[PDB]
Amino acid sequence: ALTTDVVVVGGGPVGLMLAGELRAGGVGALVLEKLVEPVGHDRAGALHIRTVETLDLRGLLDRFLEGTQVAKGLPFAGIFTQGLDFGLVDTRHPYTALVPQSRTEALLAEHAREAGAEIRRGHEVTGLRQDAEAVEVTVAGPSGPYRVRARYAVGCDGGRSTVRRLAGIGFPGTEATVRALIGYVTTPEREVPRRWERTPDGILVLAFPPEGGLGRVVVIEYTEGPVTLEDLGAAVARVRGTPLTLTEPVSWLSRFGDASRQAKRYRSGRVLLAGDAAHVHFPIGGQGLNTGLQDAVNLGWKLAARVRGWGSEELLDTYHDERHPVAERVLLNTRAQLALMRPDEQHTTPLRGFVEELLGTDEVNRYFTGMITGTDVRYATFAPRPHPWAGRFAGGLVLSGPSGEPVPVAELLRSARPLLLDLAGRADLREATRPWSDRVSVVAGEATVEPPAQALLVRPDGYVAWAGSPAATADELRASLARWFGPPAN
Amino acid sequence: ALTTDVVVVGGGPVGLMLAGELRAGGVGALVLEKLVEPVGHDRAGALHIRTVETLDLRGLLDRFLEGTQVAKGLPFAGIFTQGLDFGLVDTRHPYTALVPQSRTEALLAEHAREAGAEIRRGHEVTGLRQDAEAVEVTVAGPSGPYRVRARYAVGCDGGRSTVRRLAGIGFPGTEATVRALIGYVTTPEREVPRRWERTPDGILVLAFPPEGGLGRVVVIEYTEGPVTLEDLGAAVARVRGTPLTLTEPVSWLSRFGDASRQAKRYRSGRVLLAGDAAHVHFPIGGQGLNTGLQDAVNLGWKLAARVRGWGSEELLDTYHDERHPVAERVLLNTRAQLALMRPDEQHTTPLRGFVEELLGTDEVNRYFTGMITGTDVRYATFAPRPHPWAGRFAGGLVLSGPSGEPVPVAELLRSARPLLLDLAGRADLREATRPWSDRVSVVAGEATVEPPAQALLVRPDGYVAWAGSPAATADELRASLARWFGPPAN
Ligand SMILES: Cc1cc2nc3c(=O)[nH]c(=O)nc-3n(C[C@H](O)[C@H](O)[C@H](O)COP(=O)(O)OP(=O)(O)OC[C@H]3O[C@@H](n4cnc5c(N)ncnc54)[C@H](O)[C@@H]3O)c2cc1C
Numbered sequence A, B: 001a002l003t004t005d006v007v008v009v010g011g012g013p014v015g016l017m018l019a020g021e022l023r024a025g026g027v028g029a030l031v032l033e034k035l036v037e038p039v040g041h042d043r044a045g046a047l048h049i050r051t052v053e054t055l056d057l058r059g060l061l062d063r064f065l066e067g068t069q070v071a072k073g074l075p076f077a078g079i080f081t082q083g084l085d086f087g088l089v090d091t092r093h094p095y096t097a098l099v100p101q102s103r104t105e106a107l108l109a110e111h112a113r114e115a116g117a118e119i120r121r122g123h124e125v126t127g128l129r130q131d132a133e134a135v136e137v138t139v140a141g142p143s144g145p146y147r148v149r150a151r152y153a154v155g156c157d158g159g160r161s162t163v164r165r166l167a168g169i170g171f172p173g174t175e176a177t178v179r180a181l182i183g184y185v186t187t188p189e190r191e192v193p194r195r196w197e198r199t200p201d202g203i204l205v206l207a208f209p210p211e212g213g214l215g216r217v218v219v220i221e222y223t224e225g226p227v228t229l230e231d232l233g234a235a236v237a238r239v240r241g242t243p244l245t246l247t248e249p250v251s252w253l254s255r256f257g258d259a260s261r262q263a264k265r266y267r268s269g270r271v272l273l274a275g276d277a278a279h280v281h282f283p284i285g286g287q288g289l290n291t292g293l294q295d296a297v298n299l300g301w302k303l304a305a306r307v308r309g310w311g312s313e314e315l316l317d318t319y320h321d322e323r324h325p326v327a328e329r330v331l332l333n334t335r336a337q338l339a340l341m342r343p344d345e346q347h348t349t350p351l352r353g354f355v356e357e358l359l360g361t362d363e364v365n366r367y368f369t370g371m372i373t374g375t376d377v378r379y380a381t382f383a384p385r386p387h388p389w390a391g392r393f394a395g396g397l398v399l400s401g402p403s404g405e406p407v408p409v410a411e412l413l414r415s416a417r418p419l420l421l422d423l424a425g426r427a428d429l430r431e432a433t434r435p436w437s438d439r440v441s442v443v444a445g446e447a448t449v450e451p452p453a454q455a456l457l458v459r460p461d462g463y464v465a466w467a468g469s470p471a472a473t474a475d476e477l478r479a480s481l482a483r484w485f486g487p488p489a490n
């Protein structure tokens, strides 16, 4: 309790995002990151719709878009002729932001710092002890071992999570059967076609400048450790069927696989997990970091609330309840996509043909678009029956002010407080909310939503806690307010 | 020309169906079947919606339904929880008729005979010669070799088609990588669960009486010739993971695979191909014989018409044009389903999960239902733009007579003549059709169809040749009649 409120283990993008969220929630956040210096990641990155919407409601979207290429559509499982159609989903931001992870990390690190989080680099957590009041973290640092005492510890320490094992949380799942290499390497060859291809021997992307030079190589072969330029070239030759001249300078080289695992519990007492610490899977569709950043924004406000007292144990438990199912579906969909890309002219090629056809129908395209981009995420939480809007994402709504001015809910959410939106003129609900005004802001505005709602009680993460029609009463809102956001003041 | 009008090579179900069709068309049909006696086939069979509708419009449905079990829905690629929904497609016969092929063969053989086709058993075609006027078939028969002269020869002689090779028609496609066994064998074991199952080692169906005895075994293993009871038992043990006691009496045992081939041309001069002679593929979904019987009904009326003179060369060419694309899609969908059933917990199991979900949506379920049952078949033929009803199946329409009595188009089609249906009161179209009355029947009736049509010119196979709205003229109908059904009489 005495060193800090929350110790965030791991200063990757997820840990950094969480620290920002905890600071926005008015609690102390100490990030302990093992590495002195950041390391290399894929130089191509993707933040999809719901992540973009999430950044917007935290006021980070602008800095993430500056200088950024965006994609207005996406392939699906190596199908490029019927791309995922952002027009078929409801958003104010129909695009994917192609931000390299290194840049996402740098931006979040600066934000955590400006928000007052303490970030210690070269500090490795080596031990973890928990009792009814606090967590103690043991740390190997540049000036020797020391202990940190906190109310909570969150493992944001990646796929090889120290926190997860120390807390005795299971990581059930499958081991890899697919072997991929990725690299940024040089070719002397000119006019190497820039494309993805699928042969009987694997999947290959080559993306080099037409004049030669440093380029992107991804190679995937069906049924961990150092990678050499020779390894990469041999793999490329196997898949492609023709050698490609690859030379120094070599900028980055890595291995990855399709091991698919998920933490059985996202919470064990005063220890929680987020990001790859909580789920790993093959990188297909660019979903891992998106899921993690959203884990962080789900958790941050709830954990700060718990520390401050008005967030209940029940509330904190909804982190696992809400977010475990999401990553579960991500694991499954990445595995499914690997089946859809399997090199095999006999059966899989014909299947891909029908899937491609189906992608040209609005209903199926909408399904896979919602899946990849996160627009289909909604929660079933604290059911009383619930209003249709309960659990839906409201972060992208825009209201009309009394003078006709646009009032984006994304902007209202930047202060990281829950909001009561009065869409219809419900002075009774506005008044009923007064005893919670130390926590919840009330904003009246004109808007029609579908399905209809006269009022929306919105969580700091942009999802709707409670909603009301003309039949809703102040008593019902009082009950929801108490359950979600604690007892009335005074 | 002098022995017979058409020589049908092969007296399997497709050859027998075709002979019936040729007789209905008023031409001679001689079926030459190599085998003296029929042989064994799968004891479980399936005739789907469009086949059922087709039998109806030839007046054979009743005899095919007598004593028959029907299925009101179907699994898809070993998915049983969201079956294909016959309610989502337009038909008067929402079911699959579970007729064993041996019974289909016997029924069609009796019908061909009663219709006046000549059927010779134990007569093997060994040679084929073709000129500008006729085909000569050389035959090894019970009283020695002889020759048959005909206007046309149709190879309905199965996957190993003699006619196809003799005519120099290619059979491009893939060789098998999947090995299946099927058998009717005895077990002494009691209460062997009746079910389909998919394990990491294959696909297996066991269907035995609870008290033991003769039962159905199908086993499929992923990457031709005699099969023993030992072979079957060893395969069952590999897939199931536990041996099953199998003993005599053994009633039937067979091998099959997923070789997928299709005749590059369905017609070469005076030689045509139908049925498995024209296309083979893995038996999944029960589509092979359905496709063949429909091949036969597409061809029969057109070929008889050609023999009689009013059917043009252009008309006969539409057999290939219309039917080749159909079997092409069947080959592809069977290959695709094998991908969907592939034993593989790593990737395919998760994919199957999403496919199962999608099958619970009307749009995707309708798609696969139409695919398997043939309700999605429609033709793009003799485009003039064409009326929306052109090429659609009208065989299941029912009209109201002048006295209110129901007048099924299926019954009207039994005489095997094209029909002009006057749905609105178009005396001008009725009159315009008189010079073709030796070939085409005119029937007035009340009915609203969707999309709207005032008149439908229906082919003997139940598909629409031409349709008209109020703007259609008698001149347009004259032109269509001439193109489809020959010059006006007199
Ligand atoms: C090739 C590739 C391409 C990808 N592309 C995309 C994409 O386009 N879009 C997308 O959303 N996702 C993508 N991903 C997935 C994404 O990179 C991960 O989901 C993301 O790195 C997870 O972030 P994290 O903060 O949870 O974990 P990490 O990035 O692994 O950070 C964990 C941090 O914890 C620190 N740590 C570990 N142990 C300790 C300890 N004991 N004490 C202190 N600190 C510790 C580590 O040093 C590390 O810095 C891709 C992944 C790969 C491999």
Ligand SMILES: Cc1cc2nc3c(=O)[nH]c(=O)nc-3n(C[C@H](O)[C@H](O)[C@H](O)COP(=O)(O)OP(=O)(O)OC[C@H]3O[C@@H](n4cnc5c(N)ncnc54)[C@H](O)[C@@H]3O)c2cc1C
Residues within 6 Å of the ligand: B009, B010, B011, B012, B013, B014, B015, B032, B033, B034, B035, B041, B042, B044, B045, B046, B047, B101, B123, B124, B125, B126, B156, B157, B158, B159, B160, B161, B162, B163, B182, B256, B274, B275, B276, B277, B283, B285, B286, B287, B288, B289, B290, B291, B292
């Ligand atoms: C296990 C299994 C289950 C199946 N289940 C279904 C199902 O449920 N539904 C479905 O629609 N389909 C099913 N099928 C496919 C179906 O059996 C075939 O499509 C069907 O047999 C094709 O009929 P056919 O008349 O074209 O050829 P065949 O049945 O092979 O008949 C060809 C005939 O030609 C004769 N012949 C060959 N050469 C000569 C010659 N030179 N001279 C004279 N005669 C010759 C042969 O003796 C044979 O009798 C299944 C197939 C298998 C293997």
